[PDB]
């Protein structure tokens, strides 16, 4: 921003983290922290009192930043990431870093923590070939050993305790299983044991270790459990469940959940058994005997915790039933004996219709009355985090909507016209009777206006969805956000408060979304209407969803059923009798479907068919096609182009925004002459990248084509260049950025189109009647940074100057004037250049901190920038969405339309009064002087 | 129309310019009257000026006296006689223009109701920085100058005569000039045929014995 005074008056930022993958809550707990890691390769520490962020670290967005393993120890966190390559020790208290090291090659299998003599001092890392022990204080390697027979035996588990030895377990499915015991002090292979299991196939996700290092696995085929004491046994012991009278589910994988609160001592003798979906059993093992401590049928989730010497389990289920009211209850149980702890039940509910929780993490503490209080952290199905406490009316402490970290679409709809004036339109300015009526009603209106004015001055000394009304300047709108998880949000654009929410069931992670505003709020008897198109990635099925932009409720009009995959869509400007723009969909069989398919719309399309064209681009084969609509809503092939994929591949295709207006139809270079622009409204810019990745044979191709006929207006190739490419194509120009390898720098390139000196036709623009190619001017510049996003500002009439908003990787957003990137700038200054007032060419563009539109509200991992006109000729609304969301407003031309906020009324009144006083005094003095001069 | 304007700018930027320029003009007029001048002339100057005026009046109206008197006066005047402040007026205009440009420029003020050409644009848009805006829209300084120029008639009307706005050498030389000018004048009596003109018609005794003889005051 500017002036350091409007800070926080117009802009706002919201920060987010991705979907939780690992969490850790056990702490002092005098310090209130919650260390979390998400699926967006980001690790953060959230405050538990409120839910804010204390510190956050963001890694690479690609697969080279995924977190593989996470552990906690005292006040430190240990992370293994980058496909089992990098290990880090985060200091939780300050948010810095203790150390970071690189492991050897291989695939990560498991991470463990070991110790000796009641003191943990080492970290154990397991890879498909080797096992390594490193120091914990400094991270220096202690030793590495090679797992025997690693070629065929897949090692999957690591277990140890304060004894002084370390086990490693490997399996071959339906085959022998091997256990190798090493010693911590030096690292010799001191024991090896082999057994045969022709019935199991997995070890990591099904087996467990309980008590004094006793392995336990389930077997549904044999309908029993198998146990082996790793210390003093070399044969499996089978135990049937008919004694405890259980039953494994059909076609389900049972699980064993042990616990080990302290890595030094042995594990607890009690463990959970996940038997069937929503079926658990808390059992206790003692010398080859299993005791049914408790069973839990029809339960949702279970979890463990431990404080001091008390180990406590937490069970979450639902009351009535596909639960009835989406209402769930959480209860606390003692682990030593199956027993509820009274006065511990927590009841909560979910607002959405078809959601359900998936994770449960519990933090426990000891109360003053020697009781066990606790709090829970619940993640739902739609990426919603809730922090529940143990109160009565404040069961929910705080919540976070983490689905807003993957926004894929965005629209702005202006609020409906104020009811006090929308309905006043009918009663005001309405013809009633002859010449004697309108003036009488006008004077009555003036009288009531006077009464209102008197009422307003009498009191000088004495957010709801249905009360929303638009501002006089229309500077407040209704943001509509669509998230990759399948959730729609309706948010106020002035303070960023969620006004409504909606959920779409069964949305695949990699679908394709596209929404268009059909009907706005300019027709009171009809409701505003928006449409959303969702296409499945794999099956190819496509669906439509019609809703209200203001309230979020589904509309009564049922959208049609798309029996064929949808190839593309189009939004005509033709309005039905209900003022709804007609939408066309072209499917896989090249026949179009209209919506709404009313009789009037059908007749209009029957009349206007030969003036609508479709163009389709296939990047896999590099084939472009163009069809023309026929009378009966059928299509016929018109033009076709091919680009060989073995040399180039298409990466982008850009067209001009359909809601923009160009003000001037020509440019004046002086000396009483005009240079006319070539404003083709159907031009397409296509960017292709070479398939040769060598640093001396790579290039980027640019094609300017006509969408109707298919003429290639322009072809160009830039050599020694590499992607990614960011391109902006606007009213008359194209600006694209790239990376140059011979000099290793980022470069801008600007192309500008001009016509001759006389207009070919000033009445219309038909693409079938333009037989003369335009004139292309090109230039290039050097940009000393990288780019994460690019966009161009918009305005109502296109009178203000055009600026480019550029999103850098650091987080800032730069506003670069377009007049700086002009191909007509001369290298050698001349008199004509002076009379045109053109700056001489300079090869470098500089970045200044004063040009940032966000002072320090940085946006991390930026992905999109959106601009809106906002019903005023000097202000544009900007929304930048990446991991974070930022909203502000910009004035390219210093806001010539609204009076400055620093107007000094007092000075104006004082100067007016002084002028009046001086006038009076001077008049008196002049009169007296004349009178005295008359009388000598 | 094209643009949407805030009513506050109309309420607080338009009227003050007019009020300020009006009262500045009035103050300038009154101050100019206050210290207009103070001139003093010696006796010889006024005496010679009155003599010159008398000679001019003789030359102009010698045709209403008998020729002998005219030539008697013409024998005279030939042998014996002929031969023997702003700084405050202009500087405050520029100063006030500069002050107004300093403390008011930066927004659109108003629009003229008739179309213009591109020639008008550089004059009426001193403050704004747009490029393709029409020439009808004006800035604050142009409005101030227009208001200044369009008040001469109002000042002449509401104030006495005309003000509050911007726009002998040698006695002997004058004596010689009047001597040369008078020498070529000759008497032409205007009473030669007055009687015949009188005798043409009866006297106009109509509308003379109306009303009534006055009795007292009022």
């Amino acid at each position: 921003a500017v002036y350091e005074d409007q800070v926080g008056k117009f802009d706002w930022r919201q920060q987010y983290v991705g979907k939780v993958k690992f969490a850790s809550l056990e702490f002092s707990p005098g310090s209130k922290k919650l260390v979390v890691a998400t699926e967006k390769n980001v690790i953060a520490a959230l405050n538990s009192r409120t839910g804010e962020i204390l510190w956050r670290h963001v890694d690479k967005g690609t697969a080279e930043g995924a977190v593989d393993a996470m552990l906690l120890h005292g006040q430190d966190v240990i992370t293994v990431s980058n496909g089992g390559r990098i290990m880090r020790s985060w200091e939780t208290n300050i948010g810095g870093l203790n150390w970071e090291i690189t492991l050897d090659s291989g695939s990560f299998q498991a991470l463990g923590l070991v110790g000796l003599q009641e003191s943990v001092r080492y970290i154990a890392v397991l890879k498909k070939t080797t096992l390594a022990l490193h120091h914990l204080s400094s991270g220096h390697l202690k030793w590495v050993e090679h797992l025997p027979e690693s070629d065929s035996i897949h090692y999957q588990m690591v277990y140890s305790y304060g004894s002084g030895v370390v086990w490693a377990l490997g399996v071959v499915p339906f085959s022998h299983v091997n256990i190798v015991k090493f010693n911590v002090e030096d690292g010799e292979i001191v024991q090896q044991v082999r057994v045969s299991t022709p019935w199991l196939q997995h070890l990591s996700g099904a087996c467990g270790v309980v008590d004094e290092a006793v392995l336990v696995c389930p077997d549904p085929s044999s309908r029993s459990l198998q146990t082996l004491a790793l210390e003093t046994e070399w044969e499996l012991r089978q135990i049937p469940l008919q004694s405890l009278d259980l039953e494994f589910g059909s076609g389900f994988q049972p699980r064993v959940l042990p616990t080990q609160p302290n890595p030094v001592d042995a594990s607890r003798a009690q463990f959970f058994l996940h038997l069937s979906p929503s079926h658990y059993a808390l059992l206790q093992y003692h010398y080859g005997t299993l005791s049914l401590l408790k069973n839990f049928p029809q339960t949702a989730l279970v979890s463990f915790a431990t404080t001091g010497e008390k180990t406590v389990a937490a069970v979450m289920a639902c009351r009535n039933e596909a639960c009835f009211n989406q209402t769930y209850t959480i209860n606390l149980y003692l682990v030593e004996t199956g027993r509820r702890l009274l006065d511990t039940t927590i009841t909560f509910s979910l607002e959405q219709s078809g959601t359900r929780p998936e994770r449960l993490y519990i933090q426990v503490f000891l109360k003053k009355d020697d009781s066990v209080g606790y709090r829970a952290l619940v993640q739902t199905e739609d990426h919603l985090l809730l922090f529940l406490q143990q109160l009565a009316g404040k069961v929910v402490l705080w919540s976070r909507e983490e689905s807003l970290a993957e926004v894929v679409c965005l629209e702005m709809v202006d609020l409906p016209l104020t009811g006090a004036q929308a309905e006043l339109e009918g009663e005001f300015g309405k013809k009633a009777d002859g010449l004697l009526g309108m003036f009488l009603k006008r004077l009555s209106s003036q009288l009531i206006l006077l009464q209102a004015w008197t009422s307003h001055l009498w009191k000088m000394f004495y957010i709801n969805i249905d009360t929303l009304a638009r501002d006089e300047f229309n500077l407040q709108k209704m943001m509509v956000m669509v998230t990759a998880s399948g959730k729609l949000f309706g948010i106020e654009s002035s303070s960023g408060t969620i006004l409504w929410k909606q959920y779409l069931p069964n949305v695949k992670p990699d679908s394709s979304f596209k929404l268009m505003v059909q009907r706005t709020t300019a027709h009171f008897p009809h409701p505003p209407q928006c449409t959303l198109l969702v296409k499945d990635k794999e099956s190819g099925m496509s669906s439509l969803y019609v809703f209200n932009p203001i309230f979020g409720k589904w509309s009564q009009v049922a959208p049609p059923v798309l029996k064929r995959p949808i190839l593309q869509s189009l939004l005509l400007p033709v309005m039905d009798q209900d003022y709804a723009k007609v939408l066309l969909l072209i499917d896989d069989e090249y026949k179009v479907t209209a919506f709404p398919a009313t009789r009037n719309v059908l007749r209009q399309l029957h009349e206007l068919a030969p003036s609508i064209f479709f163009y389709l681009v296939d990047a896999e084969q590099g084939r472009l096609c163009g069809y023309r609509l026929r009378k009966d809503l059928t299509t016929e092939l018109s033009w076709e182009l091919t680009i060989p994929p073995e040399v180039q591949r298409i990466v982008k295709v850009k067209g001009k925004r359909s809601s923009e207006h160009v003000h001037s139809q020509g440019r004046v270079m002086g000396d009483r002459s005009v240079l006319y622009k070539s404003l083709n409204p159907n031009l397409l810019a296509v960017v292709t990248e070479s398939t040769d990745a060598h640093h001396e044979r790579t290039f980027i191709g640019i094609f300017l084509i006509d969408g109707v006929t298919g003429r290639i207006i322009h072809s160009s190739v830039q050599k020694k260049a590499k992607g990614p490419v960011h391109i902006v194509h606007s009213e008359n120009w194209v600006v694209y950025q790239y990376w140059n390898t011979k000099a290793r720098r980022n470069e801008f390139t600007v192309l500008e189109l001009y016509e001759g000196t006389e207009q070919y036709n000033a009445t219309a623009f038909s693409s079938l009647d333009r037989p003369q190619l335009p004139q292309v001017l090109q230039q290039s510049y050097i940009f000393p940074s990288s780019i994460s996003a690019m966009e161009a500002t918009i305005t109502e009439r296109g009178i203000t100057s055009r600026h480019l908003l550029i999103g850098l990787p650091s987080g800032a957003i730069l506003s670069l004037p377009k007049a700086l990137l002009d191909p007509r700038r001369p290298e050698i200054p001349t008199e004509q250049s002076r009379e045109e007032n053109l700056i001489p060419y300079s090869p470098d563009v500089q970045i200044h901190a004063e040009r940032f539109i966000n002072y320090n509200q940085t946006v991390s991992r930026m992905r999109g920038i959106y601009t809106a006109p906002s019903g005023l000729e000097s202000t544009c609304l900007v929304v930048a969405y990446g991991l974070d969301i930022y909203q502000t407003r910009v004035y390219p031309s210093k806001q010539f339309d609204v009076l400055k906020d620093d107007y000094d009324y007092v000075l104006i009144s004082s100067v007016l009064f002084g002028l009046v006083f001086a006038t009076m005094i001077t008049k008196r003095l002049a009169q007296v002087k004349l009178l005295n001069r008359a009388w000598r | 129309p094209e643009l949407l304007l805030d009513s506050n700018i109309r309420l607080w930027v338009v009227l003050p310019i007019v009020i300020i320029t009006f009262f500045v003009g009035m103050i300038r007029h009154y101050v100019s009257i206050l210290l207009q001048s103070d001139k003093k002339l010696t006796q010889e100057q006024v005496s010679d000026s009155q003599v010159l005026i008398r000679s001019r009046v003789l030359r102009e109206n010698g045709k209403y006296i008998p020729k002998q008197s005219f030539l008697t006066r013409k024998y005279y005047f030939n042998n014996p006689e002929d031969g023997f402040g702003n700084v405050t007026n202009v500087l405050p205009m520029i100063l006030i223009g500069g002050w107004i440009n300093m403390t008011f420029s930066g927004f659109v003020t108003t629009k003229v109701p008739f179309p213009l050409t591109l020639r008008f644009k550089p004059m009426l848009q001193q403050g704004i920085e747009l490029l393709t805006l029409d020439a009808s829209w004006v800035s604050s300084a142009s409005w101030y100058f227009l208001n200044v120029f369009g008040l001469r008639s109002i000042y002449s009307l509401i104030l006495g005569q005309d003000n509050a706005a911007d726009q002998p050498a040698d006695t002997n030389k004058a004596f010689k000039t009047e001597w040369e000018a008078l020498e070529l004048t000759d008497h032409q009596w205007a009473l030669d045929d007055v009687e015949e003109e009188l005798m043409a018609k009866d006297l106009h005794f109509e509308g003379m014995f109306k009303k009534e003889l006055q009795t007292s005051i009022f």
Binding site: P573, V617, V708 | -
Partner: peptide, 24 residues
């Protein structure tokens, strides 16, 4: 006498409509 009347040149209008892009 050119370079004038330019501000009075109202823009023309489209004759066709086209939309699409990469396959959805």
């Amino acid at each position: 006498h050119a370079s004038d009347w330019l501000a009075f040149i109202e823009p023309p209008e489209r004759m066709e409509f086209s939309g699409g892009g990469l396959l959805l």
